[PDB]
Every structure is written in C-alpha cells, then in structure tokens.
Design a protein around this ligand. Structure first.
Ligand code: PBX
Length: 270
C-alpha cells in the first residue's frame, strides 16, 4: 500500500487482528507487535489527510525540542520530583535536553549548558557532512518517566539517518506507538526534522520509514478510527522552507510554510 494508505491499512489490521492488552494507565488497547511504513519525502510531505493534523503544534514542539528547552512555559503526569521547581515549570533534564546535552549534570532551566553533555543532534548533522555513508547516524530520545538514568534506561525512540545519491532518509523506531493520536503527529514531526537536517546539509529529503514495537489503539478510539477508515486520502501537501538556513539552531516557525493541505475534518480523540 502507499502514502497514507499504509497507515489506514495498519489501523484496519489492528482492529481486525489486534489482541487486547492493558497499558500502564490500566486503560485498554488493541495491540499488534511490529509494524513498518515508508512515506516518500520527495516533492511531498506526509501530513496526514484523513483528519486534520495540528501542524503548528508539530513545528513548535520540534523547535522547543531542538532548543533543548526544559522550561514548560517556553512551550506555549507521573513525571515528578520537586516543589517550587514544579511551579516554576522546570521539567528537569528531559526531552530536548537529551538531544542537546545528553548525560549533562543538570542545574536549573535558565542555567547554561553550552559544551555540556553529548549534542546528539549536532553529532548527526556533523557525521552526515564528514561521512555520509556512515551506518551510525543515530539519535535517541527517552520518556521523562524512565529517567533515573543511572539505571541505564532504554530509549523511547531511536532515529537513524541515511544518505545515498544526495538524498537524506530517516527511520524512526518507537518502542510503542499510539496509532490514533501519537502516530500521525510523530510522522509529521520526524519528517519535518528530516527536512530541516536535509536543508542545512545540502541534501534533498528521501524517505521517512516509521517502525513500531507495540502498535496500539486505545479502546476509546475505535469508533472514531472506524469512521476515519471510510475516508479517502487526498494528495499530500508540500512543505517549503522560506529562506536559506545554515545552522539547526537558526530555524524559526516563520521559516516554514505548508501548501496544498486539504485534510478531512478534525477528529477529536480522548
Ligand atoms: O551511559 C548511557 C549510555 C546509553 C544509555 Br541508553 C544510557 O541510558 C546511559 O546512561
């Protein structure tokens, strides 16, 4: 299947063959282990069309991630340690903080981290420039919850890049994927990251490959998904970068523009 058809085929397989399995909430899912889909990034952008995806949220959260921000306010549950720092909106050493300063000893969210920890994201961009053929062009993200982090906790997601013939491809592997909410969002998010990296390294985007471990549908999303399945996908839009950008830190929300986006209406999901 192709384009958004893969994602609809995957919703359908989970509904038909998914097995009931409970998550840590204790809420119910239909679950299938192991799936993959590929979305071309060539002259199109996989912002799903069978429901409207919150594009602007996708962009803004990615910029906040790229900044390595740990300040919740700068943005717009069992994750918890601290008193006045929670009121502050200080999240601790989480999210983008791992992409930019992995393993840095953490002070405060207005504290200064240049040159501290590993900059995974500059590392990716640097390797693409120094050796495009490299099979290790890999960046990892963690769920805030697992972050004891002395514990050597496993990543939530892993992102591998790949270059051939001038085209930058990305594979995202997620240990679990919420198919109703998280997945359409994550597909746009990492396809956007790919476009950004490709832009500053002089490559053209190639393929985005999305791989999951526990691919799941929340019980309360079945009916709305059953209805999304009856909708016919429309051609994906295009994503245009507006000025010439040189450094990953220099991007701004106004640098990007989506075009030809005609989704079906918003679907709201609990
Ligand atoms: O040093 C480390 C290396 C890889 C991973 Br994953 C860790 O969680 C860690 O603490």
């Amino acid at each position: 299947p192709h384009g958004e058809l893969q994602y609809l085929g995957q919703i359908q397989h989970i509904l038909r063959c998914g097995v009931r399995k409970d998550d840590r909430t204790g809420t119910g899912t239909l679950s299938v282990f192991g799936m993959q889909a590929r979305y071309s990034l060539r002259d199109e952008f996989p912002l799903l069309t069978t429901k409207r995806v919150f594009w602007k949220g996708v962009l803004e959260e990615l910029l906040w991630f790229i900044k390595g921000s740990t300040n919740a306010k700068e943005l717009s549950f069992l994750d918890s340690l601290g008193f006045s720092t929670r009121e502050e909106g200080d999240l601790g050493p989480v999210y983008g903080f791992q992409w930019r300063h992995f393993g840095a000893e953490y002070r405060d969210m207005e504290s200064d981290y240049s040159g501290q920890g590993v900059d995974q994201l500059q590392r990716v961009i640097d390797t693409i420039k120094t050796n495009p053929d490299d099979r290790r062009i890999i960046m990892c993200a963690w769920n805030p919850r697992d972050l004891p982090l002395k514990a050597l906790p496993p990543c939530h997601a892993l992102c591998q890049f790949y270059v051939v013939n001038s085209e930058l491809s990305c594979q995202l592997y997620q240990r679990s994927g919420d198919m109703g909410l998280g997945v359409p969002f994550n597909i746009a998010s990492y396809a956007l990251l790919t476009y950004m990296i490709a832009h500053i390294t002089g490559l053209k985007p190639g393929d985005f490959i999305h791989t999951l471990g526990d691919a799941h549908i929340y019980l309360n999303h079945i009916e709305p998904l059953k209805i999304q399945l009856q909708r016919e996908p429309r051609p994906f839009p295009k994503l245009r970068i507006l000025r010439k950008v040189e450094k990953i830190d220099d991007f701004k929300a106004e640098d990007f523009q989506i075009e030809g986006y005609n989704p079906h209406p918003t679907i709201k999901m609990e």
